[PDB]
Design a binder for this molecule. Structure first.
Ligand SMILES: *[C@H](O)[C@H](C[C@@H]1CCNC1=O)NC(=O)[C@H](CC(C)C)NC(=O)OCc1ccccc1
Ligand SMILES: *[C@H](O)[C@H](C[C@@H]1CCNC1=O)NC(=O)[C@H](CC(C)C)NC(=O)OCc1ccccc1
Lengths: 302, 300
């Protein structure tokens, strides 16, 4: 199995650069609005302790340089929504895809289109960790790069990049500017809370193993969801939600293995280990494949 | 941070089409007025078992090829065969053709794959040409004609077209000139690859990436000569490290202050002792599908 990103072309067509003063980052151009992180309006000195409402009062439409490549897009209005700036421009992007704005849950995965100066540089799969960080790959100038999923030509944007935490993981917002997790867009000392393993995704990977014929771990036990959740937390595993049980439905049906039966199989792995054996060729339980990712890879969805 | 990252696929997405001959369907690459696709599209499901391609091709007409770009059919006005690749001349030029080149990559080099089905892009991921000329892909029925590529300043360098899956689950294909990487043939028969080896220069590049990313547990105070390292590498089915490789690792050594032969001593310890259940960049195994260039591009 490999981490497979979505094709990025529909998003590539929406990336622009936004500059204020000498601070340049990326923005997302959909119809006649450009979305970008609000700290574009900060000087380096401002970022330590910014008063964003006051900083925005000192900015006019003509203070914003928005460029598609080297081509300027005239700003005709501006507003701030939470941690994102919305710059109304005088041109509707002809490459705007069908799109939605969505707020994802921990455990969900998405493709990141890493960009610099409005120019796409690479694409990779990320998972939202339970502590609301992502283990990304971002350098200076990457803010405003977005994360997304695609379903049948509709792009669901879920992440906009804002910052790096001292442990080297990354934090950001949805496209309404609301941070994932307890982070704020100030250049202050912030720490990601203790992370946990994404149980629903480990279960998805056990189903993927079963589908490919690797099933030694299937036991003769079962469990209740509550009993499992209480034990899983003792092993630094996330508890399962009703939604998690439901999204495992299709893999459960495909393999004929009840979700709570697989939970009991995982519990044995946690209480006794792997005892030298492997699953899908690995001694470690992978937790960044969602049940959708497993079915997406085993099917030919485009 | 450090991830396996692919090139943005938009420039290639605009070139993918569907090609059908009878009941066989796969993908094609549309550049200017030509569509490139694997020649086994002309085979029936049963022809595939043992095809004679020149004999099968002379019996086809232009109208036997159905090329669809999205919903729109392109009319085939000519066809030729170049090795294992069919070149279909269409009456329409692709307005989305990027600046491009056809290249044949070297074992150990990496490229992005755009997996497609029925002419529609499905996923993108990074692959390496293994020393035994297989790739570890993720491809299903209908993925043939999917391409691999690298992108440099808006010029797309096409290096791979997908043709088949081996019994072991690894994959084989050709360059855009139709010549297979490796000793494989486009016939529906079980084929084995030569014994694979590990790409040593890539493992070292990845160890330098782990250092850049503030990880050092595997480093040591020992040192080694190039020849003494290659003796141990060969013993562990690793590829030889050349002076050219040592040179290519130069920038990464200067950035980290770790001489190449010092990183070699580190890797030799890793090979003879194992990782003892520790991990490097979240991995339990030594990763060999990042080139030195891949590490530099992502780390700087
Ligand atoms: C936006 O491009 C940038 C992305 C960072 C650059 C390095 N890797 C990244 O992901 N974001 C920032 O520079 C961000 C701006 C604040 C106003 C949110 N600041 C930041 O990430 O600082 C981290 C930091 C905090 C405290 C001390 C030292 C560094
Ligand atoms: C083209 O879409 C397809 C890609 C395969 C399909 C399964 N996964 C893939 O990557 N290629 C073929 O179907 C190919 C046809 C030519 C060799 C004529 N055949 C193939 O990959 O099967 C090889 C094989 C050998 C022995 C047993 C089973 C399969």
């Amino acid at each position: 199995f490999r981490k497979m990103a979505f094709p990025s072309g529909k998003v590539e067509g929406c990336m622009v650069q936004v500059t204020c003063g000498t601070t340049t980052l990326n923005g997302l151009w959909l119809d006649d609005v450009v979305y970008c992180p609000r700290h574009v309006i900060c000087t380096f000195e401002d970022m330590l302790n910014p008063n964003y409402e006051d900083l925005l009062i000192r900015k006019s439409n003509h203070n914003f340089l928005v460029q598609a490549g080297n081509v300027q897009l005239r700003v005709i209005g501006h507003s701030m929504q939470n941690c994102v700036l919305k710059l109304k421009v005088d041109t509707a992007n002809p490459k705007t895809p069908k799109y939605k704005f969505v707020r994802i849950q921990p455990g969900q995965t998405f493709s990141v289109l890493a960009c610099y100066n409005g120019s796409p540089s690479g694409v990779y799969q990320c998972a939202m960790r339970p502590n609301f960080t992502i283990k990304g790959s971002f350098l200076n100038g990457s803010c405003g790069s977005v994360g997304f999923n695609i379903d049948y030509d509709c792009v669901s944007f879920c992440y906009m990049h804002h910052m790096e935490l001292p442990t080297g993981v990354h934090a950001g917002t949805d496209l309404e500017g609301n941070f994932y997790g307890p982070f704020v867009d100030r250049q202050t000392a912030q720490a990601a809370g203790t992370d946990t393993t994404i149980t629903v995704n480990v279960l998805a990977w056990l189903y993927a193993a079963v589908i490919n014929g690797d099933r030694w771990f299937l036991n003769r036990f079962t469990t209740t969801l509550n009993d499992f959740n209480l034990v899983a937390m003792k092993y630094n595993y996330e508890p399962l939600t009703q939604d998690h049980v439901d999204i495992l439905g299709p893999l459960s049906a495909q393999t004929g293995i009840a979700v709570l039966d697989m939970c009991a199989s995982l519990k044995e792995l946690l209480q006794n280990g792997m005892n030298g054996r492997t699953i899908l060729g690995s001694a470690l339980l992978e937790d960044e494949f969602t049940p959708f990712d497993v079915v997406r890879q085993c099917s030919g969805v485009t």
